[PDB]
Design a protein around this nucleic acid. Structure first.
Ligand SMILES: [Mg+2]
Ligand SMILES: [Mg+2]
Ligand SMILES: [Mg+2]
Ligand SMILES: [Mg+2]
Ligand SMILES: [Mg+2]
Ligand SMILES: [Mg+2]
Ligand SMILES: [Mg+2]
Ligand SMILES: [Mg+2]
Ligand SMILES: [Mg+2]
Ligand SMILES: [Mg+2]
Ligand SMILES: [Mg+2]
Ligand SMILES: [Mg+2]
Ligand SMILES: [Mg+2]
Ligand SMILES: [Mg+2]
Ligand SMILES: [Mg+2]
Ligand SMILES: [Mg+2]
Ligand SMILES: [Mg+2]
Ligand SMILES: [Mg+2]
Ligand SMILES: [Mg+2]
Ligand SMILES: [Mg+2]
Lengths: 94, 138, 123, 83
RNA sequence: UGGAGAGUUUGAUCCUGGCUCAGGACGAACGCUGGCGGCGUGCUUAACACAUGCAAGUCGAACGGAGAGUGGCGAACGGGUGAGUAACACGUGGGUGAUCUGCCCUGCACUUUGGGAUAAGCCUGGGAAACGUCUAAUACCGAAUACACCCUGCUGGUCGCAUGGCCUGGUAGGGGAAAGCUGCGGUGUGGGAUGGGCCCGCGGCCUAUCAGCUUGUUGGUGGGGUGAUGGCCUACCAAGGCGACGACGGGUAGCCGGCCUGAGAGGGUGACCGGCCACACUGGGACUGAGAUACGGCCCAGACUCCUACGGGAGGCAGCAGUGGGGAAUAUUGCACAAUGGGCGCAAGCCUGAUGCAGCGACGCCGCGUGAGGGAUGACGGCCUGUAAACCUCUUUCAGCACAGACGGUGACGGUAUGUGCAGAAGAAGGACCGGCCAACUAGUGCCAGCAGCCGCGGUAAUACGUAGGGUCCGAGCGUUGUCCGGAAUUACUGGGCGUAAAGAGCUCGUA
RNA sequence: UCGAAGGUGGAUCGGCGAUUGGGACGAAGUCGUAACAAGGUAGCCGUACCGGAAGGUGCGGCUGGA
């Protein structure tokens, strides 16, 4: 129904994604409902997410896509929503 | 495009007068007219005197620095050195004469290159003619 | 005018005259060669000017001026057509590109080469 | 063609003949109601409402007629019956 | 937070007033000429016709069976093009007490009970080709139960913006469903989220050489109808609606965020990228469904083209490649699902010409290379040049061959970018213009040959033509045509005029 | 019952057309000399009739008339 995607806004051989809430039907670079966060070309991948909005959209029932579900599990908004004891604490930059 | 004494001989200093000061300013620093056009349009966007910003941008060029540094005689001699990559900037190979160094930029030389590492304290003001070249355009 | 008089009827733009109508908003246009002849020019100018009638693919027939010195152009040969006036000849507003398609470049020409389509001789 | 369209053509013959049958059965039920009302026959027409209003909402339960349509039929029959 | 001008009517002058130049750009095209990287871009004309392969399949945790076949979801999304449309189509604003929503999650209650068939499989006919008898299911069906829910009657309170809403209001009548097999599901009903649908306020091209148009037309009442309000439709009464603030006609047109220009206000355009609309050979339908202009569905009618053993059939690139035409002009019948998005499945996976990339074209915007020092009585050579070369050392970016080699059980890009090594200048410069405007000057042809953006140059000494030197200006580009804005206060709202320059109706009366 | 397409008197819009009418530009070859000076009869406006052609003459007007 509603789904948390990634959308490829970069130049050639240099992708930058922004983590977008949208419909399943929409084209990849289409209209979002809301831009939550952003996110792979770094020694440490750059991941930023609004923790408040992620809990809202997951609480409604926005299904994460498979590679976004990794990023939510890393940063630990998935474990706040699910309520399982793995908790949060990851990332850094440098 | 690289140009590759007489061109200076016509000007001296080795609309009639306007073009001649631009011509020495261009063929001194070894710039092509399209690149010289770009530095003017950046200079007028910046604050202060629009003419005085132009000489700051031309003096900032990495090969110009070599000429001032005196590592290589004759600004055209440094073109042969820089593009060949002998020089280094913050531990990175700059193979580019158009590199404009900012404040706190560390220019070292590569190991070998056998034929002394001076630092940039700020971008120098005009004290360290522009009003012809400003009145040339626009 | 009064400002109410502008509200009733506005300010019309002045109607623009299109310059070269036969080309139909294209830079070049092909065509056959239906006559080849000479004319005397207008004015204190005097000479023989080579001219040709070209039916364009656009199906419009108009005079053209062959630039350069001497030409092949026989009857029923295919010819590009440029634009740009020759002001001695009255009416004549098009030109035939030289060295393109059938129209061969001018012989022995070593200066202003690009305009006349002469290939550079052996470097 | 070439596709699984060949399968979904075979379904749309099957599933039409189901829905055509139920839609037609509602018409004859609703038709026979109105002839009872226009006669001035109260006790027969009062029975035929509970016959038809049963049959309408069962067709909504199939997923044929859609419940808002099924409701607005039952509303029209009951307001006809009261007079 | 920015607003230049110049030439040309005359013997000369001032004004009015066109025409032409300097500037910036482009989905560009031609010539002459090209060395490689990075990065976007590429049928604007014929919505012209299409040969070939691929562009939507998937599940054996539903089912017989032994790939095909029934069944469930998907196929309405993704992608294409601009024909149509001057309209609630679009752009911004609201309204929905006038309504729908599969999948998704997250409350509550249930998943009771029985039957009848039909493909596959066998045996027939039909033909070049291709589309009569049996057995299962989460296929399809009689019931039961459900008090949430739908319908009708009588009545309580409150809210207000009138129909009316809401409190699952309280009552008492009548009715609504389902599926099971190895952890996923299935019906009903509250709520939330998504997507829509339908109305209206205003906004946005040309035309009166288009002045009248309308009869389901404008309204009402009772019915039909839709998810829903409505002449949406239909039967009877009423006689109204729209228009000088441009109705009804004719022409052109996808609309917009934007993009080019300008100091602005404006003018032009709607490429790529991102929304909304319409259409899928041409027209008219409906079916299935939660949802349909249903590209790669169905039916009928037409136009056009293929196969044929002449009995019969089949098909529509405005998917991606590609082909032929038309054009001054626009690309490979590429690789891969590794990455992000989507569909199905419990999952492993399996599809994806979406997408990520590669090739090709200087089509555009950037960035680097073609050498760096020293070098004179200034060799020779060409013409009335040049510290350049000659010649003395030197550096090796890109190109060349070698070795290592990616960041994003396994990567298309790719043995690629990239680094470290071996020598040697070796493999690398064009194109315009030089009468004045507007940077740069001197030596065959005779008003012929020719040049030219406007002045105007050629009728025997040419800084203007044709060639050779010498110089400028730009340089992997340089010139020329085509188009739009500017200069243009030259449609003037900002910002003009009308005695004689173009411009006061011949004069008065008077409706809007 | 509605209903595409296909059948068989006007409205609007265009292509070709024997032939014919004026316009522009070109060389200037004939026929004149109408306008600019009282241009050798002041010129021009509005009609009217006439003439190879510029033009001529009536009626009223005007100064942009010596
Ligand atoms: Mg009703
Ligand atoms: Mg003069
Ligand atoms: Mg219209
Ligand atoms: Mg469904
Ligand atoms: Mg159109
Ligand atoms: Mg202006
Ligand atoms: Mg059709
Ligand atoms: Mg239906
Ligand atoms: Mg197709
Ligand atoms: Mg389909
Ligand atoms: Mg194609
Ligand atoms: Mg203007
Ligand atoms: Mg004026
Ligand atoms: Mg008057
Ligand atoms: Mg004719
Ligand atoms: Mg006279
Ligand atoms: Mg006289
Ligand atoms: Mg007179
Ligand atoms: Mg007479
Ligand atoms: Mg008189």
């Amino acid at each position: 129904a509603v789904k948390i995607k990634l959308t490829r806004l970069g130049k050639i051989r240099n992708p930058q994604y922004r983590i977008i809430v949208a419909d399943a039907r929409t084209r990849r670079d289409g209209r979002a409902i809301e831009v939550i966060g952003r996110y792979p070309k770094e020694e440490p991948s750059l991941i930023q997410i609004d923790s408040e909005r992620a809990q809202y959209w997951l609480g409604v029932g926005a299904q994460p896509t498979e590679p976004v579900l990794a990023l939510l599990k890393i940063t630990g908004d998935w474990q706040k929503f699910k309520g399982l004891p793995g908790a949060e604490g990851t990332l850094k930059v440098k | 495009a690289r140009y590759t004494t007489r061109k200076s001989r016509r000007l001296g200093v080795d609309y009639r007068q306007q073009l001649q000061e631009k011509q020495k300013a261009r063929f001194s620093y070894g710039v092509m007219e399209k690149q010289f056009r770009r530095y003017y349009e950046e200079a007028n966007r910046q604050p202060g005197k629009t003419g005085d910003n132009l000489l700051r941008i031309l003096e900032s060029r990495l090969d110009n620095v070599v000429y001032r540094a005196g590592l290589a005689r004759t600004r055209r001699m440094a073109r042969q050195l820089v593009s060949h990559g002998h020089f280094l900037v913050n531990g990175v190979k700059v193979d580019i004469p158009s590199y404009r160094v900012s404040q706190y930029d560390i220019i070292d030389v590569k190991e070998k290159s056998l034929n002394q590492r001076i630092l940039v304290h700020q971008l120098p003001e005009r004290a360290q003619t522009e009003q012809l070249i400003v009145e040339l355009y626009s | 005018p009064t400002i109410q008089q502008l509200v009733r009827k506005g300010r019309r733009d002045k109607i623009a005259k299109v310059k070269t109508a036969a080309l139909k908003g294209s830079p070049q246009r092909r065509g056959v060669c239906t006559r080849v002849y000479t004319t005397t020019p207008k004015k204190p100018n005097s000479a023989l000017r080579k001219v040709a009638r070209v039916k364009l693919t656009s199906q419009v027939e108009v005079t053209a001026y062959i630039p350069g010195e001497g030409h092949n152009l026989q009857e029923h040969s295919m010819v590009l057509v440029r634009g740009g006036r020759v002001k001695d000849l009255p009416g004549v507003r098009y030109k035939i590109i030289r060295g393109s398609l059938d129209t061969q470049g001018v012989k022995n020409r070593k200066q202003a080469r690009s305009r006349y389509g002469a290939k550079k001789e052996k470097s | 063609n070439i596709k699984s369209q060949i399968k979904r053509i075979r379904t749309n013959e099957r599933r039409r003949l189901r829905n055509q049958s139920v839609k037609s059965s509602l018409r004859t039920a609703i038709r026979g109601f109105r002839e009872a009302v226009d006669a001035g026959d109260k006790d027969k027409a009062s029975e035929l409402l509970h016959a038809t209003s049963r049959k309408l909402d069962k067709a909504a339960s199939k997923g044929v007629i859609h419940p808002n349509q099924a409701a607005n039929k039952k509303s029209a029959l009951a307001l006809a019956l009261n007079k």
